Amino acid sequence: NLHALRREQRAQGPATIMAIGTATPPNLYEQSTFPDFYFRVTNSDDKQELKKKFRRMCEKTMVKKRYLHLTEEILKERPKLCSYKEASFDDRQDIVVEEIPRLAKEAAEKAIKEWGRPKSEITHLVFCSISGIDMPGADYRLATLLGLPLTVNRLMIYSQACHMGAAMLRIAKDLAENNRGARVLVVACEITVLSFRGPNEGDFEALAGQAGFGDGAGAVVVGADPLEGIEKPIYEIAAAMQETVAESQGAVGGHLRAFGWTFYFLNQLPAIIADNLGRSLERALAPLGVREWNDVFWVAHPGNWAIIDAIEAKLQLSPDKLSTARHVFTEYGNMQSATVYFVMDELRKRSAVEGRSTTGDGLQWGVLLGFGPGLSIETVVLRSMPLHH
Amino acid sequence: NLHALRREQRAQGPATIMAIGTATPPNLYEQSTFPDFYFRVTNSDDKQELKKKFRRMCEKTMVKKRYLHLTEEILKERPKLCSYKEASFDDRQDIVVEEIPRLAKEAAEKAIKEWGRPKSEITHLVFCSISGIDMPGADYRLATLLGLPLTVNRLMIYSQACHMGAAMLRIAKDLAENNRGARVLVVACEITVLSFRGPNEGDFEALAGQAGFGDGAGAVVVGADPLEGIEKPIYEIAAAMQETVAESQGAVGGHLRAFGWTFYFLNQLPAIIADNLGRSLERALAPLGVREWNDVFWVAHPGNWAIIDAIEAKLQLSPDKLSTARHVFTEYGNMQSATVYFVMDELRKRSAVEGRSTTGDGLQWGVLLGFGPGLSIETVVLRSMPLHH
User: Fold this and answer.
1) For residue B304, what is the enclosing H or E element?
2) Do A242 and A186 share a structural domain?
3) Which residues in chain B are followed by a discontinuity, with C-to-N distance exceeding 2.5 angstroms?
4) What are the beta bridge partners of residue A216?
5) Which of B186, B371, B182 is nearest to B273 (CA)?
6) Which residues of A are catalytic?
7) What are phi and psi of B361, to 5 degrees?
8) Contact between chains at A157 and B157 (C-beta distance less than 8 A)
9) How many structural domains comprise chain B?
10) What residues contact residue B20 under an 8 Å CB cut-off, 6+ apart?
């Protein structure tokens, strides 16, 4: 009866990524002139020596460009954003509640446009962001701006850190696979309005945060049992798993306070990540009988330049493997949960333009990776799809 | 093989609720004397007219008692919690970050204990609260307090309203059905430290919020294919869905600010909820061929007494249907996302005490119901289990 009902209602094949869309705020921030903008707007133009320290931090990041919702105009209107740790939460909430769903909507429309199917066929919405907390939430506002059916199943995931991007594919996997016809709109959106703050001579971590984080949103449509001739899977989601690394709460993390968000980290975080991938990758790839780390493709959350270097070095990958992560991080900065969607889009796009056999740079099996506070490690095994040029 | 692998890794039968645990803070607040306590600790004994009002509010709520983490001591140590609307967010964060996981742990242990099986067989943790945002978050802390294996798939749902307790069953359904052997720990925990504040003579809305909300946590183990002679389902989850009521965002909701959380409602929220249920319940129950609303059992998030009344009257339910919601509301208050789990625990126990043939008061089919800001309506169709006396 309910076993019969079960068989009827569940999907047949594995979850697939059917479309990818991305978007940023319209305001370009060049890293070479960012110290100038940052010290001027934070009324710190009378500490030239701290300004020089910052220029060197900016250069070290390896970031060329980021896109930020914030502008000098908004900062002028809302000066408390420019202080180090003054109560500023209200001004920050005013913005993120409004804009988190607006930026998400751009990335979601693009994903939907590529998918090329009606919004009425979307059954679930899975939406993550650090920011934009209200009731009704950001998911309600996003659903409403898109004109999704009132019967779409919504799930908002607030304030999980950078690995939440990968984690949403783990959730969407179960939603697409367990429900025949389920089409899952997956969105990550991050705007650094809650973490932007002026400088303090004794806070490297907070000033470092001013240098490497950008704004961005990413969206995929996820579904099993693609419609013959209409839905063209880019990747099959083969497996998804999470692992927490014992006694590493201190590696990285953050607090939410009256000043907004602040993030901490150890200098050895690049090593702590790289050194703790072994287990995850073994669980993931040993069933497929993978012999060598260079034998699969890599969609990595970049974290930072040092993190990429550490992972590449530990797994002894050739430069090509993480070059997509390097590219996105260079051109957009670290966009938290959104970053991995930008990286995934780059992999499949370079794969098409450069004439590859598959969406995973000519390779069959790949691993998508996210990592954040925990330390939390998100591993998604992807199967590439043939490219018929 | 993508399809063969899929056929082997998924569960066969419906998600099952295998155990239920509940917990509250140890501090009893009797409603009869709550006006005296509230006006005294917030230093408002010279607002006798507002006090007179609040006592009338408290009488009308029909709440007899609540359990709150907050005490006279906490309030003396952190007087900003008492102000109507000064910045007090840091004080509140300081408490909720540590306490939310702590209360959740009590409910979680009770559910695990009834389930009767090793912690190591838990594969997933799904945890919701309005409160306790930090990175790493509450799920990590809870998993750590429980001593869960590091490979448990964690998910934290922050800052969703009252209907979130229901929606976690919607989530748990797919995780459990789609993964062979999956055992999901589902936990809801709420502590009102973030919305407690002193009284303002021009704000009855916020004042009403101080009369009806309590603290608590509920937990279930959800799995598919129960072990014969080891795991005994209390209910089967046959179906679960959400819908949103158009143009009702202002019906109820709230804002997270430097003063913490405040909640808003329209006076006609009961009718708004009652009048917009039929559609959801029709979609849920028609496929089972049920002809009358009294044909099924009811596990209702209570909201408040006015809301229970309006649903009863609108659906022409006889008094027994929402009996369990009433008893839980009256004895514990609205514990937001956790309440529905107390109601569930109450139904299945009463069913056994009163000699009913099923864990659903002798009927086969039920609806577990959650509602909150959106308006959001969460409908979970349950099948009861035979009771053998």
Assistant:
1) none
2) no
3) none
4) A190
5) B371
6) 162
7) 60, 30
8) yes
9) 2
10) B111, B114, B218, B219, B220, B234, B341, B344, B345, B348
Range(s) of the domain holding residue A132: 1-233
CB atoms within 10 A of CB A284: 22
Tell me the three state secondary structure of residue A350.
helix
Helix (H, G, I), strand (E, B) or coil at A176: helix
* Overall resolution, Å: 2.3
Q: Residues B210, B330: one domain?
A: no
| Residue in chain A nearest B254 by alpha carbon | A135
Neighbours of A31 (CB within 10 A): 19
Mark yes or no for CB contact B257/A6 under 8 Å. no
Contacts of residue B135 in chain A, CB cutoff 8 Å? 159-161, 253-255, 263, 372-373
Torsion of CA A340, A344, A345, A346, to 10 degrees: 100
Q: A51 with A167: CB under 8 angstroms?
A: no
Supply the DSSP symbol for A356: -
Q: Which residue has the tokens 């964690």?
A: B154
- To the nearest whole angstrom, how far is the Cα of A388 from the nearest Cα of chain B? 20
Cross-strand partners of B187: B127, B219
* Min Cα–Cα distance to chain A from B240, Å: 10
Tokens 């930008």 locate to: A342
Q: Which residues of A touch B167 (CB under 8 A)?
A: 155
Q: Contact A3/B10, CB-based, under 8 Å?
A: no
Closest chain A residue to B168, measured at CA: A155
Report how far apart the first and last C-alpha atoms of chain A are (Å, whole number): 47
Q: What is the CATH number of the domain that holds B86?
A: 3.40.47.10
Q: Are A255 and B137 inside 8 Å of each other by CB? A: no
Tokens encoding B14: 């419906």
Q: How near does any CA of chain B get to the CA of A283, in Å?
A: 11
Backbone phi and psi for residue B87, each to the nearest 5 degrees, phi listed first: -55, 125
- Domain limit, last residue, from B233, B252, B286: B233
Does B151 share its domain with B243? no
Reading the block at residue B291, the tokens are 């002809």
C-alpha count within 13 angstroms, C-beta hemisphere, residue B213: 24
Based on the fold, state whether residues B118 and B153 are members of the same structural domain: yes
User: Across the interface, which of A14, A93, A256 has its CB nearest the CB of B133?
Assistant: A256
Residue A148 has which token pair? 């999704």
| Nearest-Cα residue of chain B relative to residue A13 | B3
Q: Which of A204, A233, A262 is the last residue before a domain boundary?
A: A233
Question: How far lies B150's CA from each of A91, A108, B107, B127, B280, in Å?
Answer: 38, 33, 20, 16, 39
Q: Does residue A253 sit in the same domain as residue A175?
A: no
Dist CA A29 CA A365 (whole Å): 36
Q: Are B364 and B339 in contact (CB under 8 A)?
A: no
Residues of chain A contacting residue B266, judged by C-beta atoms under 8 Å apart = none
State whether A116 and A200 are in the same domain. yes
How far apart are the C-alpha atoms of B341 and A64, rounded to whole Å?
Answer: 51
* Lookup result for tokens 């509301």: B329
CB contact under 8 A, B153 and A170: yes
Residue A162, both tokens:
């950078």
Same domain assignment for residues B296 and B317: yes
- B70-97 as b/e, with b when 16 or more CB fall inside 10 Å? beeebbeebebbbebeebbbbbbbebbb
CB contact under 8 A, A255 and B157: no
Residue B17 to residues A76, B295, B317: CA-CA distances in angstroms? 54, 22, 25
What single-letter amino acid sits at B275?
D
What experimental approach yielded this model?
Answer: X-ray
* Cβ-defined contact of A258 to B376 (cutoff 8 Å): no
Total CB pairs under 8 A between chain A and B: 176
Burial of A80 (0-12, 13-18, 19+ CB in 10 A): middle
| B166 & B128 share domain | yes
